[PDB]
Ligand binder design. Sequence first.
Ligand SMILES: [Zn+2]
Length: 215
Amino acid sequence: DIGIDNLRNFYTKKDFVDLKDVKDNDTPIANQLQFSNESYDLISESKDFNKFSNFKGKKLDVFGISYNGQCNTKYIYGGVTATNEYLDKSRNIPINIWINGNHKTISTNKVSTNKKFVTAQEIDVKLRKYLQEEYNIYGHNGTKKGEEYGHKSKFYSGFNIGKVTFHLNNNDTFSYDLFYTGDDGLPKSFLKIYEDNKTVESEKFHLDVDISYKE
Ligand SMILES: [Zn+2]
């Protein structure tokens, strides 16, 4: 299943997109923003055409996972925020985690943001990299961390079921499946979850994470 190696690589090894104060190119394309550098163009795709219209030609930040495009292009789903408000300090997002039923609470510099409104993508990708580093959820993390959970899953890990829930202060929520591989195991499919360019107010949410196994 190609999705095993692609989740591991795209979430936990491949460098995230992280652009600050970059100008969108203001093309006529309604569903795409575009950011150029000397070697390639990054195209962000979204279904939030109203947001994209407001962002055309503006100074923006971009964060998330890109995947290769033809010739001189790379793609990301969403990932875009307005460069107008930032917190004074990065906020480490509190994480309530249940690991095979056992609960703990943690915060870490590894899951943090200074954006007043952060994409869900930025937080999720940071979180999954942290979960891989500490719990080896996708297997083959290259350290001894998470050996205690074993290697029974198809990832060579202790886990094959999991969820991240964004828990907003008003007890609205939304969730992503930590082991979703899309229709074909390819990033162009599984990253499409981020195409809404959903954001959250960084000071006013926390994360609930559940990871477990069923044979
Ligand atoms: Zn909660």
